[PDB]
Design a protein around this ligand. Sequence first.
Ligand SMILES: Nc1nc2c(ncn2[C@@H]2O[C@H](COP(=O)(O)OP(=O)(O)CP(=O)(O)O)[C@@H](O)[C@H]2O)c(=O)[nH]1
Length: 567
Amino acid sequence: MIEKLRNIAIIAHVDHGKTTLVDKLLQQSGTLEKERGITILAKNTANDYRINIVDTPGHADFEVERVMSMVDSVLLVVDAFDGPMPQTRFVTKKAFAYGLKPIVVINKVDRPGARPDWVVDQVFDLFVNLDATDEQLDFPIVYASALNGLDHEDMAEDMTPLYQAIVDHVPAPDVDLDGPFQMQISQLDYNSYVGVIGIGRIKRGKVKPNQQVTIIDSEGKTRNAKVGKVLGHLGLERIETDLAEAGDIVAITELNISDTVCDTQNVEALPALSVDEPTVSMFFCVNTSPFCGKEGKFVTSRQILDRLNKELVHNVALRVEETEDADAFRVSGRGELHLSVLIENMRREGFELAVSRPKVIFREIDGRKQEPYENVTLDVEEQHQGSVMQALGERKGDLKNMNPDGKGRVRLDYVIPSRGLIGFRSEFMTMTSGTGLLYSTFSHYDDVRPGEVGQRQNGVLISNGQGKAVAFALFGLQDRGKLFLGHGAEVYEGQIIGIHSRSNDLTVNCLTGKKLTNVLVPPIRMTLEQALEFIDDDELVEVTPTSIRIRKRHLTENDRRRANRAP
Ligand SMILES: Nc1nc2c(ncn2[C@@H]2O[C@H](COP(=O)(O)OP(=O)(O)CP(=O)(O)O)[C@@H](O)[C@H]2O)c(=O)[nH]1
């Protein structure tokens, strides 16, 4: 059966000449339910050619590689009155960046002001300038009218020859039925009633709604109960699915993009990242603080994970997974910002969650463990080199360049391990007095320092009871350290309320003070951004739609000491 399978992507755009095609192919198979689709799997014969025409987003999201890592060739579709358009553009790049061999299709030649030839000329000039190098052919180049003249052929039925064009040029999916089973989860969708659903194209072997499998990068042992799969415009189930079909699989682990399934007996694994992988992961936990659901709306773990998976569909740099703890999730993203947008949004929506310090994703590449470094670019005034020298140095900031712009200012490019960039933005502001300007970007995974840079020089000031903030306590607490609150705010035991000027943590009291027997400094505006860059392993950022709070993982001092200690 394998040899007559056909997997392709489509491209269209602002031009209403897309599909049309799909709905026009109707000369197919007129002999659960959701979701579909993804991918209009027709069925041309005159033998049963199974033709997944998997659909590509003209929307350029946070992507399309993760489609075409399933398909083997492509349909570019273009109207004959206007030409290829600037995100028929983007999409197709990623086509040639895999070994894909485009089938051009000209639509709506029925149009009056038809430029059938000129469009093909215009393709090359805006499609050829992308190398391949093959194609060329690209021949392929079929003419069409969705509302089904000159040039090819013409014309029989217009749609009667298209089928032959796809079968002729588009190869069989080069994957092997024998041996065990394995499949890379390429696409991904969610439903609140069946969890996250696989969607990949099978790389070897066969499956059947109850078995066992395993999930790749570390452990992953879980097994599902059901397998949807594409059939016409439907997404039906059946007894089993063998090789090279864009089939889709429910109820496993969380299941993730790039991540690859495979039998437990003599298997594992699959490669391909490709580059959208993430570099950081902070844990998301349900707000276990005293103000549990007192400022939000959503808070029970079920809702958080429902939201996280709603994000796992369209957001592609995001991978999420589960822990030992019920109410905890390792949420991994391309950057620290990539995550903090998800938080800031979940906040705005009504959520309440506690979040761990962004720890980086250390990765094993060629014997040498490697940690992610980042290109860091920053402008400052001349009286802030003296400060930004020491900081980035202290965080293993290899200095690339200086562009002193004549006047006072100077620009500075660096490379830093991500691990050492965590923290820094709040200091660049605190050193430059806001007049510093800085953003940075992921560059590469290279060997580790390793040592330990991302480490706060200070300790934190923690209240030991719930109550309010007595100004007659806090006037004489800001003498010991820098302060996060002021004139009477509702707090609790475990809650962090400032920074000690040295390294030891003081568990002071913010309650009655006292009075005896028988002005306050304006506090720090800790943004979500910088509460995250603030915390330690033994600290969490609790967030409510209205408020940012920062607390120790374990509250009760005695309880925290009982685990540190160490072994
Ligand atoms: N004359 C002519 N018009 C066509 C042809 N194919 C499509 N069209 C025009 O374009 C529209 C096709 O509808 P539609 O299927 O929504 O196009 P589409 O590409 O799917 C729009 P979207 O980009 O949102 O997917 C119709 O309004 C129709 O008049 C064709 O072969 N000839």
